[PDB]
Amino acid sequence: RRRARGKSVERGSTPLQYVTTLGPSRPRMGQGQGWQKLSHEEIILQVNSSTAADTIQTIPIIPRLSVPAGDKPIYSGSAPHLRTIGSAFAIHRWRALSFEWIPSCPTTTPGNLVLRFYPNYSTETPKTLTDLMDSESLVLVPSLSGKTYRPKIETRGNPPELRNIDATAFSALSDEDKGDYSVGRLVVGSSKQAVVIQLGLLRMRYSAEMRGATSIS
Amino acid sequence: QGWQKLSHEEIILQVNSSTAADTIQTIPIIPRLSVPAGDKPIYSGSAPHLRTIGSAFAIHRWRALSFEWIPSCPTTTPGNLVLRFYPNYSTETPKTLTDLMDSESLVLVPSLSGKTYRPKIETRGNPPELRNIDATAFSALSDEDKGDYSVGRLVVGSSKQAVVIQLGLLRMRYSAEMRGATSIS
Amino acid sequence: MGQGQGWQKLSHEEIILQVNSSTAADTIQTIPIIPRLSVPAGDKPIYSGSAPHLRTIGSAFAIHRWRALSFEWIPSCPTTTPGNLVLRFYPNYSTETPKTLTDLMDSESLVLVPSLSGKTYRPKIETRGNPPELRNIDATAFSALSDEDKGDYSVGRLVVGSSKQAVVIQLGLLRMRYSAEMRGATSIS
Amino acid sequence: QGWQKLSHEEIILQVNSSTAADTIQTIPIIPRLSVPAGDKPIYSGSAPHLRTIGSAFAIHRWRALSFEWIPSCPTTTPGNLVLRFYPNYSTETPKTLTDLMDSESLVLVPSLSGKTYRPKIETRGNPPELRNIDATAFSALSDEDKGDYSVGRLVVGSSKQAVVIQLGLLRMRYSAEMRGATSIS
Amino acid sequence: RRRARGKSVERGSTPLQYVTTLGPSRPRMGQGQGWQKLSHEEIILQVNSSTAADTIQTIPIIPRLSVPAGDKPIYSGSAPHLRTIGSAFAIHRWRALSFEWIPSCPTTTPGNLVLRFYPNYSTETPKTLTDLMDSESLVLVPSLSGKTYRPKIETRGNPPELRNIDATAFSALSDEDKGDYSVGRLVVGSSKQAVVIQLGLLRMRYSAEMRGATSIS
Amino acid sequence: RRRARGKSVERGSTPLQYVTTLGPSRPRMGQGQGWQKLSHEEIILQVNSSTAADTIQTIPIIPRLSVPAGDKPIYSGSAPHLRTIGSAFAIHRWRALSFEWIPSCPTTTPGNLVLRFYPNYSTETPKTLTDLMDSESLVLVPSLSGKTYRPKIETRGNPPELRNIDATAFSALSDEDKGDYSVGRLVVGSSKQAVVIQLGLLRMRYSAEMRGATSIS
RNA sequence: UUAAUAUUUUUAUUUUU
RNA sequence: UUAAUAUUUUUAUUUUU
């Protein structure tokens, strides 16, 4: 690349599939300003779409991310390591957080995948794939790789301290009360397909800080 | 980080006194200010413009907020008008003009022009983010939970008059910042 | 002196249009660049696209001024989708829109394949110092104005052409990264 | 480039209220301000001096423009007087004193002296050049086309009184620049 | 010339005719700050006066200056090159513009020729040669050469962008709407003569800037 | 690459689609040896193939390239900018001219696309895709990109000056008379497909020289 | 860190290295 | 760029090199 102009008409190819391969990674622990630090990135969600209709899921941004131990659950997402670690602290605050879309399908699969963060749990959760993607949302074709979505969160200075809680118990909280335990939720909308297929995985890249020791769950 | 800033001034309340007794109403300080769609609601006041915009966002925080008293009565009007801000909703609401006006309150003669009351609120650095909701749904929740949705309330007390009359208007000069787009389909 | 009447700045991004293709022929839609973007109330209309959020806020003001504007194409179709999509902005409301997909792809247009993600188009618009103040108006009422008068209400229009497919399909979405300034409160009660 | 500067102050309107209901009139901001020579005028207000001069030029632009309320009633007069500027003519005109006074508006008690309202207008650098016409012909054109002839309109709302009385006068302090001589044969 | 005074009483001759000869000129094209620049000077009007009465013409200052395809149109003036060029752009703005009177008659011919620019099309167009010349106007004897009239226009900084349109269609516009397409109009008033004669030509010297590509008329 | 031999057996991949992206280009104007110069490249043709049979189109190489105002017209191709410019001159001559095939379909689409230039309009225009491609023609698979076809034309020294005319009127000329107005025509043959599809666009890269001012069309 | 724009009991927005 | 005059939520006017 240089400088002299032209008409700029970029040419390129395009695969049949965008491959990704996640090898063994080691989480990164660390002591901080009186805090415990943990930076890592794990797969929190599998997006299998149905032929019946579009699918809209919701993941609560909480340290002990797991699937509410009930029946007919209102949430998705499991962040194993992050959970285990966080289950030993009472307070947390985010430093870095972003969700990366890892495609697991051919460039042939049509439709779109949508990611959107909602700051307040008392916010009218959309039911339309079209209403969901209206704004503040990552939108792409299910086959595309390397795209990531970063929730608008205060991570500078000293963010507000949120309190850790257990997935199910959180699930049980009212809406005006979920605020004290979570930054917000990540709604994952994916269009339907001709037939049963796992569009891809949703990878959570993060850096949480936790404090206040706790016993057994 | 997504913030949208909006600074303006709107008249949010009309204060007409009854002859039965003294009138003490309260305006909840919320972006989506309107009067609750219920039967005989608790919260008074409405700010059409502000809310129309506030309806577009899920979170807000204040940078500047003051209230001005605009009289509509003659110099011959007696009694007083009282303005007082209450930070916590879990705080025992007055039922007397003399109790309401005890402290931290603007007190004047209904006919007096151009006075203003400025509530105590953090506007420095980065205040706490508040979730905004709709008037109705708000008045519908516990005082413990009201905090996360509003800075506090503005209690407006006013003397009763000889006969039914409009004492004046109550203006709100502000500047909020909001973020978190909502669906207005 | 002089009550708060100053501008209110608002910058954001929003998806304002879904492009689906027909088998009849190539499709040439047009989006009017207005704060209160929504589809006109009439049947067999001229303009497409709706910006719910922007509009709602726009409904509260009477005057708008553009400071930042660009459009990004977001595919929804497969890599095997033939033909191409085209973007071309027209600042003058009285310059007859082209009739052919081809001569719509001129020197000031962006042309690409439907499946290609990530490209964007930035129209040439004065945003320096203090552009011309434009008046806010509703979609329907707008599409009712005469071209000569449409000018005072909109910066320009974004034409969006797209090859016809073998069979009905959703090509993609069209996003709008903007930054408008508005003033002149209205009545929304 | 031909400009002629003129800065002055003239009283352009007399506000007398009726007892039937609240009065809401509007003054278009045009150099050649006078009341439409027609039956059933949409507009109100007249500025003899200013127009006499404005009749000599074809183009104008503003540098300074404010409006002062001069009361004519006693301290015992109730109600309020409302002043509000509207930038675009294609904007839904209020029909309620409470809707009109919602925002961006001077509001006071009819008897209150010396207050003023300053509209939002570009006076910096070189504002847009506006063509000036005659009151009548003006009120006679579409809202879309009204823009090219005027900055905006000043809507004046006022409470109804017990009995027919002159509330006060409305003064306009300005400084316009005009060019393009016309024939005054 | 020097300095020492005297009484200053200038003497001079005076021809029977002031000759002018316009040879082939080449228009000057050029790329600008994202604009297209064109500076040239062409003859836009022929002034033939009648014996019946005084003549008052009007030329709309527009890029595509030509005469309205209408039967008994109201606008005169044709600027060929400028039109062709500008018919490929949607927006224009003036940098330099003036009208020069090129006489084509003897110093014998009496009367006057009047040039005046009117900024707003909604301005009461005079009908009198006397009312026309009242002010803001170039006034001279038809025989005299080298005089030019410059319309008072903002040409500094960044003048307002006007929109290009086609002569006829423009002619069709209302008055409140002509403003968006033209700076103003040039009214050309010329007194009558003893008998059929072409007083002279009206030469338009200019420098327009245009942008926004357009197709076929 | 070096020198030492081997057996040379080149290996490589192959996309699903060859992408192209035409951003905003600025045409290049310029003054010359008394001529007017213009170099640019615009899309002059859209090739949509039918399922009924093979398609054979013809584009006349002329400055004012546009489709014939008519019914059941015979010449395709529209070159907007080039036309507008050229509609202001009476004479033209080519310096550089080539046609580039810009594919808009998957490497899956079969068949061929054929480009061939014919110097004399009085030449028996083929009806067969097979006869068309016999010789002097660019032939490729619809999916392939970056291939261009250059018409065999004298562009050195001082080529013959041809005369500008308007598309329709040209369409009207006899054959023995078309010669004076055009270098030749470009026949575009494209095989049919399983179903309605736009194989691609045909981009015209050029450098014409024009002279002799003209008025309105 | 710098440039632009908007508000003023305050910060928010866009761009550049 | 300079000199004069007029207005002040602003610029406009005339002259000189």
Ligand SMILES: [Ca+2]
């Ligand atoms: Ca709570």
Ligand SMILES: [Ca+2]
């Ligand atoms: Ca108009």
Ligand SMILES: [Ca+2]
């Ligand atoms: Ca011949």
